[PDB]
Every structure is written in structure tokens, then in C-alpha cells.
Amino acid sequence: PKKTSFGSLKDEDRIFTNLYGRHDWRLKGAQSRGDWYKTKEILLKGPDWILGEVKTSGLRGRGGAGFPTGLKWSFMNKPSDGRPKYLVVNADEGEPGTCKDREIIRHDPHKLVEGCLVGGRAMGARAAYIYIRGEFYNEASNLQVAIREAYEAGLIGKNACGSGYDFDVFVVRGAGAYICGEETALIESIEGKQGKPRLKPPFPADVGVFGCPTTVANVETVAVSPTICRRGGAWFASFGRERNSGTKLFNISGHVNHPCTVEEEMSVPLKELIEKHAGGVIGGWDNLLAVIPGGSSTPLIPKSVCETVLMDFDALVQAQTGLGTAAVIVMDRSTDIVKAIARLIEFYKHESCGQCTPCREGVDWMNKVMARFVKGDARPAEIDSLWEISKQIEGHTICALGDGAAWPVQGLIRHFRPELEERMQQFALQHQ
């Protein structure tokens, strides 16, 4: 009646039938894989039917927030006040360990552009603003030529799939930043302004791009949308756990035998994923020291908890971390966790928005103290202060990256505090 375990998602049920780039990513191959089927009725059925299956699917946020897509998109179902409604797609891929979007932009672009069209119909939006990271050049052009093919087929824009709706698609290439991944910075960066995220609520559903009703969405979040409506929300709700339904690409990287990404059912025991696709962490399972479940922002977790913990938003939560973006990063025994964290939070300093006080002063301060810990010149007292200033960073920032950089520091402290302490005594001994 219900799935006791999870995993081994049916290959027919794998939404991204070209995620490995082993099929024609042009228009002809895409529709040969099920893409662009009966979009007419999908567009004709209106926002009510499209959002209904989104509610039925219960698609959780695939961009690193986990917010239910249903009511997020339902904010657009509202009569127009004159300001044209827009839909933007976040393709920044800023998070270290994120690779899921990068492959599927070029490998199955037409599925993505059809995802915007279905999403925009429910959204009542006018134009699509896919904000691709500037470093992602070749894939961005790959997606844009796909849009040209769709335009020549009369699938988007004027009379989208012969349904009367008019939906334009624009691929805006960024100029390189983690911060642009944040939804308000993406709006700010699209507007030509500095890539600095704006404050909280005025809402994007009300005040978005150019002061118009918009809503950001992760590429995978809108990529699954066509496959959602064609097969109903009942497809996606069948897999996954309780309100952790569905599948997701899993970026397995780090000290593993076969570093790769793979679409698979979500809420799967973490040991199964790293052992099946990655062939286990190099040097065996016991060689595993810690796992960053999804994205750098989510705190790392030691192997003592990595034995079972299912890969879903809730299960990571009692695991004192988050699912984030399902970017599995695996450190081995030989890995220096203190060095790895310092490298991780040094990245946050470089990719700091700079606007708000905490994430700018604190994260750079986090660099200085954590660098001292890696060398070991620090003193044992400073361990807890780093925890305190981490809490000062948390929840006091306009941007969520501040909390995205405080969590790794807290996770490192809570799970490997003796490691720094002995490393700290080592410095105090040889230096005398």
C-alpha cells in the first residue's frame, strides 16, 4: 500500500529521459521522448487545472527552499492590475556541489521551455526570463537554439501550440555571482542593477521584475511541470515520502568511486544512493568521514547518521541539516574537515553580496577565525564564540546566504569539535 523503502525509480518514470545527453536534445528528439504532447489541451484547460495537479503533486521546492510549489504559483492566479505578469527561471547553479541544472539545460532544453509555458499559463505570465549563469555559455546557447526551434514550430509566443496564449521566452545570461541565485538578486540582476537582493515582503508575486507580478522558480521545478500535467499529480505523489514526494537529480560528488548525477526517487536511504550509483565512497563505506547532503549551505553530517538517513527534506531536518539541492558531497577519512569547511566558507566570503551588515562583516570574520583554526593558532575558547557569531549571522540578514554560511560553521562545530581541539593542541605543542 505504501513504500516502506525508497529507491530504484522506474526508468520509464525518470522524467529527464535525456539527462545524460544520450538522446537528441533538439526539438525532434524531445517530442520523440514524450515532450510537447497535447500542450494544446494543457494550455486550454487553464490555470485551474494546471495548478490543481500541482497541488495534487505537491511539488516541493527544488531550488534549495523546499517550499510547496502549489500555493507559490497560486499567488499569480489573480486578475491583472495593468502591470504585466512575468515568469523567471533561476539557473544560477551557484551552490558548490550543484550540477543538476547544468546538464539538463543542454540535454533536454525543450522540456524546460515547455515547462515554462505550462507554468506561465497557470501563472498568467507574459514573458519567460531564464537567468543562466554567465559562465554557463555553451549550454545557454544550446537552450536558446532550442527556443528558436520551438518558435519556428509555433509552440511558444504567438498562439502557443495553437491555444491563443502568447508566451515569450528570453535567455538572460548573468555576469557571474552566487548571489544572483537568490530570488530577489536575480530580479535585481535582471533589472540591470547591481546583483544585490532586495528586502522582504514586498513580494515578487506583487512586486517582482520591473515592479511586476513575477515568481522565480528553479529550473528542475519547472522542468517537471509538463510531465506533471500530462500524467497528473498522481504520478509524482506516488513516489517519495509523506510530503516528501517525487524524484530529483542527485549530485553525488567528492570522495566517491563514481562521481556522477542521477535522477532517482527521493526520500531514499542515503547509504543506498552513494553505494549504488557512486559505487560507495572510495576506500569503502568505512572510509566515509562526513557527508554534505545537499548544497554547501546545508550542514554536513557524520557517517554515524549517514548510515540510514533518508534523502528527503524532513529526514535531513531531524538530521540537523537540510535536503537543499541534493548535492551529495562526500569527504573520506583522509579529508581534513577543518580545511574543507574553511575552503567552503572562504567561497562564501568571495561570493558575498556585501549589502547587509552581518553577511559582509561576519562571513569575512568567519574567514579569519576559521583560517586560524585550520592552521591551529587559535585558542580553545574561540570555538564557542564562532558559534555565537554564527547565530548572530543567522536570521539577521536580508539574504539567506548569511544563514547559508552560518550553518556549515555550526555543523562543523557540533560534529567535530574534538578535531579542532586536538589540532589546536598540536599547534600549541610544536610552537613553544
Partner 1 sequence: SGVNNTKKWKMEFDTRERWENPLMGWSSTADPLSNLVLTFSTKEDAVAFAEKNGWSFDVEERKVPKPKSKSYGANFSWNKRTRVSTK
Partner 2 sequence: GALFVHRDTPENNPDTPFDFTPENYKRIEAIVKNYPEGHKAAAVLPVLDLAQRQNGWLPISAMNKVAEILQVPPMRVYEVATFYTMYNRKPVGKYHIQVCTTTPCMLRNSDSILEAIQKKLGIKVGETTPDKLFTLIEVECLGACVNAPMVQINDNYYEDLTPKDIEEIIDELKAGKIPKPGPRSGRFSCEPAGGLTSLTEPPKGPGFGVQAGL
Partner 3 sequence: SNLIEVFVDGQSVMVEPGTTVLQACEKVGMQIPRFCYHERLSVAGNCRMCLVEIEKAPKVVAACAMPVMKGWNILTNSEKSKKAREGVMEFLLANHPLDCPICDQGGECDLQDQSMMFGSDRSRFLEGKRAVEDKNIGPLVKTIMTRCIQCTRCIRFASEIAGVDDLGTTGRGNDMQVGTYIEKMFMSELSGNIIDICPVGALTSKPYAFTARPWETRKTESIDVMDAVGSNIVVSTRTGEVMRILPRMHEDINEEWISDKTR
Ligand X SMILES: Cc1cc2nc3c(=O)[nH]c(=O)nc-3n(C[C@H](O)[C@H](O)[C@H](O)COP(=O)(O)O)c2cc1C
Residues of the shown chain interacting with partner 3 in the complex, contacts defined by CB under 8 A: 177, 179, 194, 199-201, 349-358, 360-362, 364-365, 368-369, 372, 382, 385, 389, 391-393, 395-398
CB of 374 to ligand SF4, least distance (A): 23
By C-alpha distance, which of 279, 327, 281 is closest to 100? 327
Give the whole-angstrom CA distance, residue 309 versus residue 201.
Answer: 35
- Give Cβ neighbours of residue 304 (< 8 Å, ≥ 6 apart): none
Partner whose footprint covers residue 32, from partner 1, partner 2, ligand SF4, none (CB < 5 to 8 Å by kind): partner 2
210 binds partner 1 (CB under 8 A): yes
Encoded one letter per residue, x for contact with ligand X by CB under 6 A and - for no contact, window 374-413 reads -------------------------xxx--x---------
Q: Which cell is 97 given?
A: 556541489
Under the criterion CB under 6 A, does residue 367 sit at the interface with ligand SF4?
no
Is 402 a binding residue for ligand SF4 by CB under 6 A? The answer is: yes
Looking at residue 308, what DSSP letter applies? T
Q: Which does 352 bind (CB under 5 to 8 A by kind): ligand X, ligand SF4, partner 1, none?
A: ligand SF4
Pick from 221, 225, 253, 267: which binds ligand X (CB under 6 A)? 221
- Order of strands across the sheet that contains 87-91: 87-91, 127-132, 168-173
DSSP-derived pairing of the beta strands 127-132 and 87-91: parallel
State how far the Cα of 350 lies from the Cα of 59, in Å rounded to an integer. 33
Contact pick of 113, 179, 289, 315 for ligand SF4 (by CB under 6 A): 179
Measure the CA–CA gap between 395 and 348, rounded to whole angstroms. 16
Query: Which of 355, 367, 390, 397 is close enough to bind partner 1 by CB under 8 A?
Result: 355
Find the helix packing angle between 46-57 and 225-238, rounded to 10°.
40
Residue count, binding to partner 2 (CB under 8 A):
90
At residue 92, the 3 state secondary structure works out as coil
Of residues 399 and 425, the one with the C-beta less far from partner 2: 399
Residue 182 binding ligand X, by CB under 6 A? yes
CA–CA dist 109, 91 (Å, integer): 12
Q: Is 3 in the site for partner 1 (CB under 8 A)?
A: no
Closest among 228, 202, 212, 224 to 87, alpha carbons compared: 212
- Output the CA torsion sign for 88, 93, 98, 104: positive
All three cell numbers of 382, joined, read 574561540
* Chosen from partner 1, ligand SF4, partner 3, none, partner binding at 83 (C-beta under 5 to 8 Å by type): partner 1
For residues 127 and 167, the answer to whether their CB atoms sit within 8 Å is yes
* Cβ count near 65 (within 10 Å): 18
Residue 373: Cβ within 10 Å count: 23
> Near partner 1 by CB under 8 A, which window of 46-54, 90-98, 124-132, 184-192?
184-192
Contact of 397 with 404, CB cutoff 8 Å: no
306 is in an annotated binding site: no
C-alpha gyration radius of the chain: 22
Question: Looking at beta carbons only, is 169 or 180 nearer to ligand X?
Answer: 180
166 binds partner 2 (CB under 8 A): no
The answer on whether 101 is annotated among ligand-binding residues is yes
Tell me if 216 contacts ligand X by CB under 6 A.
Answer: yes
Task: Give the DSSP H or E segment for 292.
Answer: strand 288-292
Residue 164 in the binding site for partner 1 (CB under 8 A): no
Options 55, 83, 173, 276; binder of partner 1; rule CB under 8 A: 83
Q: From the list partner 3, partner 2, ligand SF4, none, pick the one residue 197 interacts with, judged by a Cβ distance below 5 to 8 Å according to partner type.
A: ligand SF4
Q: Which of residues 262-301 bind partner 1 (CB under 8 A)?
A: none
Name which position in 399, 412, 420, 424 contacts ligand SF4 (CB under 6 A).
399
Which of the 8 DSSP states describes residue 361? I
Minimum CB separation from partner 1 for residue 36, in Å?
Answer: 33
User: Which residue ranges are tagged as binding site for FMN?
Assistant: 62-63, 65, 72, 90, 93-94, 101, 181, 183, 216, 218, 221
Q: What is the binding site for ligand SF4 (CB under 6 A)?
A: 179, 197, 352-356, 358-360, 397-399, 401-402
